[model samples]
Target: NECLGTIGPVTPLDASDFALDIRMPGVTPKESDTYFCMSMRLPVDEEAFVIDFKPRASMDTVHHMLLFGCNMPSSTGSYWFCDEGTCTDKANILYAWARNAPPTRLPKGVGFRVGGETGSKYFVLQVHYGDISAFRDNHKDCSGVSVHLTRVPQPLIAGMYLMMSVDTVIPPGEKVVNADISCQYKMYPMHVFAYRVHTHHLGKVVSGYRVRNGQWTLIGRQNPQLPQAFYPVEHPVDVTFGDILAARCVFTGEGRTEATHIGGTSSDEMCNLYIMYYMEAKYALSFMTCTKNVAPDMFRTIPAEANIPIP
Candidate 1:
């Protein structure tokens, strides 16, 4: 795909499509690593089907970026310093980028919602600037993600289902470390369309699946080092009432001489499996995760293993 401002080709846009952008007014070149959080508020109630997401940045000063849909503003100020792995505030991830990834669109008949009664009007942009010690003399930094949203809402509204493990500790001399988690959604049926996995460096094999009545169906899997972009699923995977959703993350201590604990920074580690799906009305939860700020309910261990879970 052609890379233009990290914005790839997407569905055609008309006059009705909304172009929402959170821009950095100025970025001073700093000698040390920094993470900046920029804030923006919707003047009016808004709702749309996000068709395109593009991260605008220069490779020299920008390390990564994440856009969040928050219930309230992080601060009244335009920008402020924030955490790296997570930008403070009770919010849900709208879009994320690293290594200047190109744009992506949602699947047909499926779209994500923002604003209206279910969503908040405030939003935040968190951009990370890696150690810019080398570019102190001459450096430029400007970063933000542009979102192209259509006024047209889809028949099936989308929700992000997160399955991951926390407090994972890999001992030295260990070959493999794994975390298995499961959850059940009994309210209604959901059709999963896309999947993506996240891990810092040691992640070797990461996967997710749907288990029901002793049968398992693969959802998606990846090496976790790929562009960190979402990919279409195998197709025709659905989780109905009483169905169990599960995920597993595998890591290797192959070359490590010491133990590695799950942390937020790149040098540390993370294991997250993101599943994008859709159903009839928006569920009570727009997003769910197994750890950190825990989501909701959880259940059994499929592919049961001998392990001591952190509680």
Candidate 2:
């Protein structure tokens, strides 16, 4: 319905296509250590191309939402707490949103693939409910994302990659704290077009860059304080083999006594960059996160341990 003329040919995907209507179960929100998840299946027999993403949920009960494409859903029921860890094999990121950010649409001729019997046929939506006790008792929450898809596939397939700053700590009463993550892409050449920056509350700027042929090019730099929507790159960047992908997250921890730790809850802090891209050759590893969580220096030397000093 939002398609307009002179904007080139376009199509809008909505609930009429296929969607899940899952609610929060109307349960009281936990103060912390709580992450709720529900499982759903996509019964598509062929490939589906997603071009637009729409999230429907209020800010009062939801801290963030993430949709995961999985080969198998968790054994847990429709609603389960995965605060510790949620098991998913061959999972890929489909869409992500926090608080109440606006929807994001990919450039024409670029879309994320879903519902292929060979690709992802099932999915799960995870919601993080912060301090629900702080919310007013009104009505239950109905929150879900609407994905616009078409039967037609694009010449280039698009997907998202998440990068994080884990195993890093920020000292209190300090400014200009930073967490840096670097990796090298070995897959086919990829063109990045969009980026989204996410931080708990102390984040200032999240910047991403690519180093190729000894030349450095900025992908996108975002202010986390903004509405948290996916913004297009000023110019698309090509990441080929031997190219170094790096991102830095800046934070300020002033007026605090103790350090802010890293965790899932808002009380803790997180530094993540969501990068959207497309490639001619598709890989099972659609989403790559340069995290400190892995061992053996696989993929690239990920910065797992860092400490900020107060001066």
Candidate 2: deviation at residue 97, Å? 4.4
Candidate 2: worst 10 consecutive residues by lDDT? Answer: 1-10
Model 1: per-residue Cα lDDT over 1-311, one tens digit each: 11224433233457667666666646664656588887766544766665567677767777777777776655667577765323345666667676745434566666677777776566688887776766464443557877777767667777778776765677775787876666765757778887767887787767777778767787877777665666568584898877777776777777878788764434477788888777775453466654532222332444433222211
Q: What's the TM for model 2?
A: 0.69
Model 1 C-alpha RMSD vs. true structure (Å) is: 6.5
Model 1 — TM-score against the truth?
0.74
| lDDT by residue (tens digit), candidate 2, 248-309 | 78788887789886534445799888887888745433566676432223224323221222
Stretches of candidate 1 above 4 Å error?
A: 1-17, 29-34, 46-48, 59-63, 72-76, 84-87, 98-103, 129-133, 136-140, 150-152, 234-236, 254-268, 282-285, 291-311
Backbone clashes in model 1, listed as residue pairs:
none
**Per-residue lDDT of 81 in model 2:** 76
Candidate 1 has an lDDT of 0.66
